[PDB]
C-alpha cells in the first residue's frame, strides 16, 4: 500500500478519496518545426513527458503535450514547459546559433489582451487561444497603429 | 499545407511527394562462342499501340 484504499470517515458518511502527486521528466526528443514564414526556424521538443511522483521518483505517463495546458502557439505550435529551443537568429553581420532551454522557470505568465478589454483581466469565457475584438482600429499610413496590450507583469 | 483555422490559425507546411512510374526493358545477345556480343543493334517497338511505334 503506497496509495490509499477507500474507507469512510464516520459510520455511513459515504466518503472515498485517494491522492495522486505528479511531475514531468525533461524530455530530449528532437522535433525541428519547419518555418519558412520567418527566417527563424525553431525546434521544440514534445513539451515534457509527464510522470507520477510515487515512491519519490518519476514513472512516465507519456507525452505531456496533449496533457498539459497552457502552451504558447507559435503559429499554432505547442511550446510549453520542459523543452529546448535551438535558435538560429539572424542579423546584418550574418547569423548566430544560440540555444535557450525552455524551462517552467522561463514559463512566464503573459496574456496579450485587446485595447478595449482590461490588460490584467484575462478572458476565460472567451476561447483560450482566441478572442474576437469588436472595436474599430483605423490605420493611417504614417500612424499604422495595431494597439494591444502585451501584459508583461 | 494545413491551415488549421480553429481557435488558432495554425500554419503547417507538410511536404509530400510522388515518384513517377517508368518502365525499363533489357535485351541480351549471346551465340555459340558463349561470349556477349557488342555492337549489335536491338530495336524495341512498342507493339501494344496497334503498330510498330
Amino acid at each position: 500500500n503506497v496509495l490509499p484504499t477507500l474507507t469512510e470517515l464516520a459510520a455511513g458518511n459515504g466518503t472515498f478519496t485517494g491522492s495522486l502527486q505528479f511531475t514531468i521528466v525533461p524530455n530530449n526528443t528532437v522535433v525541428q518545426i519547419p518555418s519558412s514564414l520567418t527566417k527563424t526556424s525553431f525546434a521544440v521538443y514534445t513539451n515534457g513527458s509527464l510522470a507520477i511522483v510515487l515512491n519519490g521518483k518519476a514513472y512516465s505517463l507519456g507525452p505531456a503535450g496533449l496533457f498539459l495546458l497552457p502552451f504558447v502557439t507559435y503559429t499554432g505550435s505547442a511550446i510549453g514547459a520542459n523543452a529546448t529551443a535551438i535558435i538560429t537568429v539572424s542579423d546584418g553581420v550574418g547569423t548566430s546559433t544560440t540555444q535557450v532551454p525552455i524551462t517552467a522557470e522561463n514559463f512566464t505568465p503573459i496574456r496579450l489582451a485587446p485595447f478595449q478589454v482590461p490588460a490584467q483581466v484575462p478572458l476565460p469565457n472567451a476561447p483560450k487561444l482566441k478572442y474576437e475584438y469588436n472595436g474599430s482600429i483605423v490605420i493611417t499610413p504614417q500612424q499604422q497603429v495595431l494597439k494591444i496590450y502585451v501584459t508583461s507583469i | 499545407s494545413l491551415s488549421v483555422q480553429g481557435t488558432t490559425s495554425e500554419s503547417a507546411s507538410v511536404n509530400v511527394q510522388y515518384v513517377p512510374l517508368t518502365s525499363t526493358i533489357t535485351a541480351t545477345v549471346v551465340n555459340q562462342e558463349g561470349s556477349p556480343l557488342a555492337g549489335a543493334t536491338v530495336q524495341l517497338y512498342n507493339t501494344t499501340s496497334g503498330s510498330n511505334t
Binding site: 522535433v31 | 511536404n15 515518384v19
Partner: peptide, 29 residues
C-alpha cells in the same frame, strides 16, 4: 505525435512519398 506548427500529425509527416492508387488518409490531432 510530431508537433509541426501546432498540428499533432499522426499523418502526414513531411516528405511522404505516394504510389499509383494509394490512399492518403489525414490522421491529425
Amino acid at each position: 505525435a510530431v508537433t509541426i506548427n501546432g498540428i499533432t500529425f499522426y499523418s502526414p509527416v513531411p516528405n511522404q512519398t505516394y504510389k499509383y492508387g494509394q490512399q492518403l488518409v489525414l490522421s491529425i490531432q
